[PDB]
Amino acid sequence: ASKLPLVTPHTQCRLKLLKLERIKDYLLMEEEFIRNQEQMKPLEEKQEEERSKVDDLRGTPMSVGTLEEIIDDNHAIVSTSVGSEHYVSILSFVDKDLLEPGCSVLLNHKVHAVIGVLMDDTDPLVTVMKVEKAPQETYADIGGLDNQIQEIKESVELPLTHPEYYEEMGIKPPKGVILYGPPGTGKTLLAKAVANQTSATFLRVVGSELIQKYLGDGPKLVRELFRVAEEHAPSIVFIDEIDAIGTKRYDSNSGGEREIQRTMLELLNQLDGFDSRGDVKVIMATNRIETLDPALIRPGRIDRKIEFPLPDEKTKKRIFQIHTSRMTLADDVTLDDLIMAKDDLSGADIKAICTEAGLMALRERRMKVTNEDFKKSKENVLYK
Amino acid sequence: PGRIDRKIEFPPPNEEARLDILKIHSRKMNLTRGINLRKIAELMPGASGAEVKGVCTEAGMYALRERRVHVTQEDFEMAVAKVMQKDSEK
Amino acid sequence: LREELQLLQEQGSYVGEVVRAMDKKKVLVKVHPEGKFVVDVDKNIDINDVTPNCRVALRNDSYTLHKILPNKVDPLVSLMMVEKVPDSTYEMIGGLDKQIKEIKEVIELPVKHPELFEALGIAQPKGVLLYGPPGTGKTLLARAVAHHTDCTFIRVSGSELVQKFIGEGARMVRELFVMAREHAPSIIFMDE
Amino acid sequence: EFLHAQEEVKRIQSIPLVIGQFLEAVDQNTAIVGSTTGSNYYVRILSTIDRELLKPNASVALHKHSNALVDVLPPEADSSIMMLTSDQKPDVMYADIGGMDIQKQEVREAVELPLTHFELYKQIGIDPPRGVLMYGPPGCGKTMLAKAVAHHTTAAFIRVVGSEFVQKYLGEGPRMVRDVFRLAKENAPAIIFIDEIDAIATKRFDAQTGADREVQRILLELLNQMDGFDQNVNVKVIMATNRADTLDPALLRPGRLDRKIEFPLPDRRQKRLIFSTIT
Amino acid sequence: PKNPDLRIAQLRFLLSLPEHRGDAAVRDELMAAVRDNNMAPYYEALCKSLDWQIDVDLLNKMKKANEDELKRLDEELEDAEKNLGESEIRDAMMAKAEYLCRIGDKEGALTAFRKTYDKTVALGHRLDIVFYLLRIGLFYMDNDLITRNTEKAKSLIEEGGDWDRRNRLKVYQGLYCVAIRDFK
Amino acid sequence: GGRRFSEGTSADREIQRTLMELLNQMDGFDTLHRVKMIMATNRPDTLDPAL
Numbered sequence A: 001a002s003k004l005p006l007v008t009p010h011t012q013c014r015l016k017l018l019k020l021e022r023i024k025d026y027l028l029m030e031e032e033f034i035r036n037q038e039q040m041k042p043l044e045e046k047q048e049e050e051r052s053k054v055d056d057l058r059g060t061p062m063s064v065g066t067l068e069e070i071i072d073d074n075h076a077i078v079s080t081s082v083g084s085e086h087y088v089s090i091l092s093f094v095d096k097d098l099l100e101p102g103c104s105v106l107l108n109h110k111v112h113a114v115i116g117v118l119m120d121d122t123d124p125l126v127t128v129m130k131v132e133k134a135p136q137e138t139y140a141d142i143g144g145l146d147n148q149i150q151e152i153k154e155s156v157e158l159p160l161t162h163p164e165y166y167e168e169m170g171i172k173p174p175k176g177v178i179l180y181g182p183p184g185t186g187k188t189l190l191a192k193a194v195a196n197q198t199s200a201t202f203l204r205v206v207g208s209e210l211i212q213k214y215l216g217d218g219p220k221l222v223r224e225l226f227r228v229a230e231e232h233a234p235s236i237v238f239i240d241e242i243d244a245i246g247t248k249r250y251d252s253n254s255g256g257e258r259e260i261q262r263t264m265l266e267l268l269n270q271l272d273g274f275d276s277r278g279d280v281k282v283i284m285a286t287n288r289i290e291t292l293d294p295a296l297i298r299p300g301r302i303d304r305k306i307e308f309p310l311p312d313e314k315t316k317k318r319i320f321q322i323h324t325s326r327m328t329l330a331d332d333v334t335l336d337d338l339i340m341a342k343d344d345l346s347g348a349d350i351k352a353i354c355t356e357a358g359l360m361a362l363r364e365r366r367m368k369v370t371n372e373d374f375k376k377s378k379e380n381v382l383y384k
Numbered sequence B: 001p002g003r004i005d006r007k008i009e010f011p012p013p014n015e016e017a018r019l020d021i022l023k024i025h026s027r028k029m030n031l032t033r034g035i036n037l038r039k040i041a042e043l044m045p046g047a048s049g050a051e052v053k054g055v056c057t058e059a060g061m062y063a064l065r066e067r068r069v070h071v072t073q074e075d076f077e078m079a080v081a082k083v084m085q086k087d088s089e090k
Numbered sequence C: 001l002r003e004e005l006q007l008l009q010e011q012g013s014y015v016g017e018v019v020r021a022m023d024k025k026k027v028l029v030k031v032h033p034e035g036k037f038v039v040d041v042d043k044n045i046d047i048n049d050v051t052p053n054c055r056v057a058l059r060n061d062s063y064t065l066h067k068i069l070p071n072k073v074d075p076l077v078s079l080m081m082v083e084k085v086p087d088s089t090y091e092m093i094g095g096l097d098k099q100i101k102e103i104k105e106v107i108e109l110p111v112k113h114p115e116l117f118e119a120l121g122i123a124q125p126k127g128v129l130l131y132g133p134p135g136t137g138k139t140l141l142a143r144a145v146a147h148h149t150d151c152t153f154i155r156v157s158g159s160e161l162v163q164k165f166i167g168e169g170a171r172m173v174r175e176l177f178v179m180a181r182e183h184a185p186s187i188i189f190m191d192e
Numbered sequence D: 001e002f003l004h005a006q007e008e009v010k011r012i013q014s015i016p017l018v019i020g021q022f023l024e025a026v027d028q029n030t031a032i033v034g035s036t037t038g039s040n041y042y043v044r045i046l047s048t049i050d051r052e053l054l055k056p057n058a059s060v061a062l063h064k065h066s067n068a069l070v071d072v073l074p075p076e077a078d079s080s081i082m083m084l085t086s087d088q089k090p091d092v093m094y095a096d097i098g099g100m101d102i103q104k105q106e107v108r109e110a111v112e113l114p115l116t117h118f119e120l121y122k123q124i125g126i127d128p129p130r131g132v133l134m135y136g137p138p139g140c141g142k143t144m145l146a147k148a149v150a151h152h153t154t155a156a157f158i159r160v161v162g163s164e165f166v167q168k169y170l171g172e173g174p175r176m177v178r179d180v181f182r183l184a185k186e187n188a189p190a191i192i193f194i195d196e197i198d199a200i201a202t203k204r205f206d207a208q209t210g211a212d213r214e215v216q217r218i219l220l221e222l223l224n225q226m227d228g229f230d231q232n233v234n235v236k237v238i239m240a241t242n243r244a245d246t247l248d249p250a251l252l253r254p255g256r257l258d259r260k261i262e263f264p265l266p267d268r269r270q271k272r273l274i275f276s277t278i279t
Numbered sequence E: 001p002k003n004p005d006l007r008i009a010q011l012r013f014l015l016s017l018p019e020h021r022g023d024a025a026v027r028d029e030l031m032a033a034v035r036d037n038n039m040a041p042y043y044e045a046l047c048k049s050l051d052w053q054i055d056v057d058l059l060n061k062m063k064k065a066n067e068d069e070l071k072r073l074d075e076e077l078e079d080a081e082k083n084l085g086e087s088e089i090r091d092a093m094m095a096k097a098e099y100l101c102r103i104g105d106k107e108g109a110l111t112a113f114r115k116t117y118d119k120t121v122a123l124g125h126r127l128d129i130v131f132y133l134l135r136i137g138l139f140y141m142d143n144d145l146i147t148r149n150t151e152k153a154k155s156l157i158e159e160g161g162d163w164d165r166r167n168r169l170k171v172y173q174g175l176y177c178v179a180i181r182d183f184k
Numbered sequence F: 001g002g003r004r005f006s007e008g009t010s011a012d013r014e015i016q017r018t019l020m021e022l023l024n025q026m027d028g029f030d031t032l033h034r035v036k037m038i039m040a041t042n043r044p045d046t047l048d049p050a051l
């Protein structure tokens, strides 16, 4: 286990032949030395004799306690499950490295002495915020942007996959990325494509669910979000609809607007605190960009600012090609009449027409979609 | 428009639809032969589908307060005039 | 009969709650309000028979596993038992024939026949909005559709007696999904 | 020789006996009880007990050391007992309540008329109401009308104040709930009256204090125990409050509370009837 | 359907047992027999009747009409399963088994009623099936098959009030208790 | 005394239980006889209308 990290010839050289035949000697000499221990000092099996000596030391009732401090000369103050805490001693088979204050431990039943530590069963909010599998199709599903698709790879993907281009330039990659535009133009859609591609752990939270009902519970949730993001890996934090922290007021929140503010001051810390940050990228998305605090959008916390426009009439035709790809489209229809139906129909409007027109076919058990399906589709989707 | 897949409107019931709600709810009442529920459903000018059980459960109280064991057709028309009175209250 | 004068002098057995097992024939059991205990199992008990979140018997002198104690409740079951939705069916629907046809195309069909949309190549729908004046049967129609295709009809109201079965604090609402993806063909319902 | 040991086994029942409560049985002759020390146990039986005297929620007897089933008991509660009926009626007649023509008539139809004339509700089939919730502004005869019902009744009347379930010790309260309805079961076709449910049934909770974790377990008992009825027992629950805002709609579901009575404030027509009765 | 079906059973009594009165009863029953697709219940009633030598073309136009309703079930059972409702194969012929109860004998009824008895999850269709089992149990005088399903009827009414399913039911024991000599 | 609340903090949960015990022992199901009560306040603005 981690015996030798050197592989660098990568050929049929004598050096790769010599190095591993050196390691062949260090292994067998280690083997033949430790072989002579049980030959001259048998004295136990060592497979279970020292084990059953431990297993007869620690009792069959094994109470679970909780650390709260450590004094280094193998005794520490531990909390029982009731609340009455003790000052027991700590053993030597206890591998004194995984002991943090608050970690679950194993005590004795008689003298409550610290026998072992316990693996934590975590967590019912880490698994809430951690995206398990890749969501959907690739960047080829998007179509039409082609300018900001380059921009997001520039800040997130290319820093991860090619960490050579920045070093030869002697530079650090840009920190923050915000995505803004009219509603339904594909802000959330592009973040799915990043979650498709990347190898980093991907964390997602809506901006609406940052606000809480108890005092101080809001800023506590932000402090433990970036705790989780740092303690895994290179990671991506995606915050969606962050204008919703300020626009809507809810009566569940006990503090008024001056509790929203204290939540935003904690988030304003976590992006550009004085603590050593690490490898955590932040992606943010909104549609009301003029509402939120400009202290949060300054360079240093967010570097790249990406605007999404409404789809153009030659890029609209690309979108109809995408969402009507795998459907049995009857040749009655002409897509160009559907393009300029609304002068400013979003990309979300196109998928809303294409799905609803398919639902009109299943009312009549058909398999192909005719023209009058789309004729009564836009009456149903758009005009109400 | 991409968010909600289908929106469904529920109208208040008309004369043909106020009738069968009475028909399904009157299954567990003890009825008297010869009632003409069609006349009863026309007395309610479309309240909702919730006052129908508001009437038919209360029609048993009229037959109980005069100690009967069968619900008669004059108990319902006595019951409509009380439930639609609270329609005329606020 | 004479043995009962002697055997009843034996002390009682504790009852517990298995969280989950680990290596070398040991499990993790909590007692009433008493702390979590790491105990061993007896020879007459299989490990894979020990379900997580299942009661057991437990001796008290050595805390040895005794016998599996059955099936207490699901917390999803106790949640619906608190709310007591008025269980309905199609046979008590009065004059809503066109809405039943609409609600089946969105919910009933993409369970019994998910292949039928791949033949059209459109995404299967997810969300339904019902509207109209109050008292026109929004709840009974939604309860019936879950009843007739074997769905776990879950309604959330944002209460706090409900709260102790979802989680201890539930800083999100999204912790509801852990019970929901365990009763996989489920339906979430929300009031006004 | 068998009859010698047949009586010999009952030495275990002698004096120093503790009290638990039956929960269920695994099998023949072995069961699960919960002690009044709070902790549950997996216990053995004594064979002379008729098993078919068990489980509504049966108060049992347990050995003080070996802790197994010993004996089944007549029911019991400390709070309250049974409204001692001699010097306990608050002697208000119906005639003292002037100008309450709707509500005196309508509380009759849900409380004591299904108490006596039970079969008409069975024969017509109109599903008699399980409990009733009465409310309104303070000083409208909420407590007064309950006095007059408890004077002209023929059934047992159980009268509790709804701020006494919060005992100091843990588990006392949920025991205090479940033996009220057990006492309303064993005694009679009785009537439960609970006042100031705002002391128990609120909306917001907080699972960090302990004083609020207990109250959460208070409500889940009576919400459970009102579901343990089967239309056959004549146990009616009258409940009166001052603020209907601060109540959980989990408590107002059909099956638990279907009848709601407001006591509006009288204006002129019911006003002059009050002046006649008082003066 | 089984709703005009008891008058047939009285008219078969009107045919045979009045011995001299055997002419207008074999006319008006045949007025109902060789229409409305009746095939099975009258072969021996033809043997109790006269010759009626050419009934073969009278049968062939009706056993074909038996098949035409039979094959449109056979043209329904594959379209109702491709896009399934609530087992619309069964749900179609849960109404058309009572036709096949009238047209065929009990066998096409008994395997399709017990089929659709496991279909519906509310008793409002179940308990109407049981009334159909009772009414054929009177024609073939199945005095042992009525003993089962009457309890299986009566076990269903208690949830709900179901007085049109109870007061109608009291008529069926009333005509059965007077069929047997039990007048009190 | 207080008024009541729409239940802001967790402290005044169990004060209103202490308050509703007081209101019942005055005039609920008891001949409140020979027991007189005298109360004083600087401002009665913050008192429960049930009191």
Ligand SMILES: Nc1ncnc2c1ncn2[C@@H]1O[C@H](COP(=O)(O)OP(=O)(O)OP(=O)(O)O)[C@@H](O)[C@H]1O
Binding pocket: A141, A142, A143, A144, A145, A182, A183, A184, A185, A186, A187, A188, A189, A190, A287, A311, A319, A322, A346, A347, A348, A349, A351, B002
């Ligand atoms: N340019 C586009 N190319 C392909 N699909 C698109 C495009 N724009 C929108 N869509 C479709 O619209 C749907 C919704 O897009 P998305 O929600 O990402 O827009 P949005 O701006 O994030 O919405 P909101 O403003 O509500 O957050 C997506 O499922 C996507 O399929």
Ligand SMILES: Nc1ncnc2c1ncn2[C@@H]1O[C@H](COP(=O)(O)OP(=O)(O)OP(=O)(O)O)[C@@H](O)[C@H]1O
Binding pocket: D096, D097, D098, D099, D137, D138, D139, D140, D141, D142, D143, D144, D145, D241, D242, D274, F027, F050
């Ligand atoms: N006919 C009447 N109607 C209403 N109130 C009356 C009548 N006769 C007397 N009262 C007065 O109303 C007072 C209040 O009685 P009661 O306590 O039942 O009211 P309440 O609604 O319970 O008020 P609270 O809930 O605040 O105690 C009685 O003390 C009595 O003095």
Ligand SMILES: Nc1ncnc2c1ncn2[C@@H]1O[C@H](COP(=O)(O)OP(=O)(O)O)[C@@H](O)[C@H]1O
Binding pocket: B021, B049, B050, B053, C086, C092, C093, C094, C095, C096, C133, C134, C135, C136, C137, C138, C139, C140, C141
């Ligand atoms: N169309 C209907 N058919 C039968 N009963 C109905 C109908 N509409 C309402 N009800 C009655 O209304 C009650 C259900 O309330 P509901 O109307 O579903 O609430 P909502 O206002 O949310 O729709 C049931 O008790 C039911 O008896």
Ligand SMILES: [Mg+2]
Binding pocket: A184, A186, A187, A188, A189
């Ligand atoms: Mg979006």
Ligand SMILES: [Mg+2]
Binding pocket: D142, D143
């Ligand atoms: Mg009062």
